[PDB]
Amino acid sequence: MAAVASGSGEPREEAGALGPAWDESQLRSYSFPTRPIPRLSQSDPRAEELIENEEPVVLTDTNLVYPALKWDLEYLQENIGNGDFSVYSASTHKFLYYDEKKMANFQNFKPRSNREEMKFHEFVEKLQDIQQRGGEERLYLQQTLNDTVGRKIVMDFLGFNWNWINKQQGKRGWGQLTSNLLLIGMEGNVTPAHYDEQQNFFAQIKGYKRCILFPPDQFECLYPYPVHHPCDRQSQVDFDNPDYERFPNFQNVVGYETVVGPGDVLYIPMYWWHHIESLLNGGITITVNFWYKGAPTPKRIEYPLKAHQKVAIMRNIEKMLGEALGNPQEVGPLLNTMIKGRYN
Amino acid sequence: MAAVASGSGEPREEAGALGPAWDESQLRSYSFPTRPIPRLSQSDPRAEELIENEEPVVLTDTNLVYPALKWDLEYLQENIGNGDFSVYSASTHKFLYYDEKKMANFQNFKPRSNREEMKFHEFVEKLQDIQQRGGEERLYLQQTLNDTVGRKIVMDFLGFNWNWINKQQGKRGWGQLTSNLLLIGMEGNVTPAHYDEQQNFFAQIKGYKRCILFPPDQFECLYPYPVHHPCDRQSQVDFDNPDYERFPNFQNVVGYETVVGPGDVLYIPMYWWHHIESLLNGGITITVNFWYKGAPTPKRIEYPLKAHQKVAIMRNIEKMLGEALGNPQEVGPLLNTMIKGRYN
Amino acid sequence: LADYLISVGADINKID
Amino acid sequence: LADYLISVGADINKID
Ligand SMILES: O=C(O)CNC(=O)C(=O)O
Ligand SMILES: O=C(O)CNC(=O)C(=O)O
Numbered sequence A, B: 001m002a003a004v005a006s007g008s009g010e011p012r013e014e015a016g017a018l019g020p021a022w023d024e025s026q027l028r029s030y031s032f033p034t035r036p037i038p039r040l041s042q043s044d045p046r047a048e049e050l051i052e053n054e055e056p057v058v059l060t061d062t063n064l065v066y067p068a069l070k071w072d073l074e075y076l077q078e079n080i081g082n083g084d085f086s087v088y089s090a091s092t093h094k095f096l097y098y099d100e101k102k103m104a105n106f107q108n109f110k111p112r113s114n115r116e117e118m119k120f121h122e123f124v125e126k127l128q129d130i131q132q133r134g135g136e137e138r139l140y141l142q143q144t145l146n147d148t149v150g151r152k153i154v155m156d157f158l159g160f161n162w163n164w165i166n167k168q169q170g171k172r173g174w175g176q177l178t179s180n181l182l183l184i185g186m187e188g189n190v191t192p193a194h195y196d197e198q199q200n201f202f203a204q205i206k207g208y209k210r211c212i213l214f215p216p217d218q219f220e221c222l223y224p225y226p227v228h229h230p231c232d233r234q235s236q237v238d239f240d241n242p243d244y245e246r247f248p249n250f251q252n253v254v255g256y257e258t259v260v261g262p263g264d265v266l267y268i269p270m271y272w273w274h275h276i277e278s279l280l281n282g283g284i285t286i287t288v289n290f291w292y293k294g295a296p297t298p299k300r301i302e303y304p305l306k307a308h309q310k311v312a313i314m315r316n317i318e319k320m321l322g323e324a325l326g327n328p329q330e331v332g333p334l335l336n337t338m339i340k341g342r343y344n
Numbered sequence C, D: 001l002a003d004y005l006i007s008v009g010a011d012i013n014k015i016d
């Protein structure tokens, strides 16, 4: 009987009989099924095939950020330098991303998280203050690595496996590395489902993160915000309380998931939705991603179109209409007028 | 109490005490209100103002087609030449226009009228055959005037008031005259509501036609077919039996109407919807229209946009998506995906 | 471009 | 053009 959906599978055993890395109670509970993302060696031809076909895979032995595996708050505070770091703060576990430039278009959007620039030692101290007073405030540091980092971090950065990732960039025809985002979160933090328009090698350093991915063909089930809204590219669906009246096809969504730990690298293909959560009671998490611009669009389109190309078309229709109407608020009414009693 | 809608008004009296030109029983009955289109002399500055503002007006004294006022079936059969004339045939009074080039896109569209090419004497004879046998078949001749017409028709054509209409073309910045369509219909024939993308001076020659116009801002109430459908630019609504479940905003439509007779010229502005019916029991009708390409689009758009510019935008979105998806049938599903739970 | 989207065609109820 | 509509941007969850 057809009535597969293993999810992250049986938790892995840490070497030296150090016990399970995590347990099922540290995962949040959601309404949809999932199947596992494959975990493979970087020397496995299957892994090359998945990356080539823009499908996710966890690579267990790239050594991509090997020198960063010794990173923790004390080491970073000593060596990360005196630059500013963007720290998001929220009274909820969900850190929904928003584009500050688009907030003028939507005056009624009130962010639930707020950004504060601070030095790294201030970040560590605010964490301490929270932890000792039993506070419910949550922090998520998210900052691109820049030229202000200290000498030891430079040394560690130079020690990444550029041989391997530069070869991937070349083999896939991708554009330049645009940035490395340092992500330091508290246990239980969640980045809600969204897609990015760049290719991502997501390199886990400390702690464990559950990553739930959805292919671009589930656009219909995930209901992104309007393109001019500050939450462009993020799902409108509250995974903790899905509104099935507004979002009926969320009842059909099916994810791919994995739990990445220190040394793992997750390939998140461009336009793939991803929901990322730091495991409950797992301590702080540290990740560095590697964002690459996608390979150029082919000069002559080949049919059938891929799912992500249809997403690109819809985004461009929304952008063009916003510019032509002179106001993004008129996009919706025009689109509805175009469809009602004509295409629906 | 605000609870104006005169319609065509009290029928006009024919000169020489020849009685009313028409009576209310010769008009079909419809569900919506209407107000009158103004009837003015071409020397009235109000008429110039209406044409300039792309609003309809009936001009009563242009002499635009003065030499054609003696036209009837016998005169035309003698002098119109031996060319082919497109004659549409239908078992209904409604002659819904369709684009034969688009029929490959929609295999399930079965036209209710059929086109037959014939000589003018064959057209007259088929009319006779119908009239004598009490048949229910209906014919509508619709043919652009071309270089095959006989010498007397050339003389009559040369006698049109080109001084007047060439001045209008110049004053409005319109493009070239593209064609003169000769329209010869049977009493009771109806051309269902549609808009054209050219400017039209509609010159009535024989019989009376009731013209019901709707401004471009009633797009929302009139539900045009998809752009790739053969009935592009025609309303989907059956005015004789409006489906208010599919077309709810047809309950809000408001028209402008008039009855034109011999010597009248109706300005039908580009993008204005028009429904045209030859009066019941009024005999055959003869019209010649004058179609002009619109004035060029301004280089820099000025806001707010006019209603017809929003129509132009929607048409271009539908066209572009058809080309990009490689198949017009995919337009609807993509548009719905773009709107559902996002803009509606 | 914004200018292109406002551009009009010249389609009319007449066979080509 | 058909090519333009398929073109992608480079937007990511990162402040400029
Ligand atoms: O790690 C997180 O919490 C969120 N990360 C991303 O969305 C990403 O790397 O693209
Ligand atoms: O006269 C008719 O029956 C139909 N005419 C038109 O749609 C027109 O002239 O644009």
Ligand SMILES: [Zn+2]
Binding pocket: A194, A195, A196, A274, D013
């Ligand atoms: Zn992301």
Ligand SMILES: [Zn+2]
Binding pocket: B194, B195, B196, B274, C013
């Ligand atoms: Zn017309």
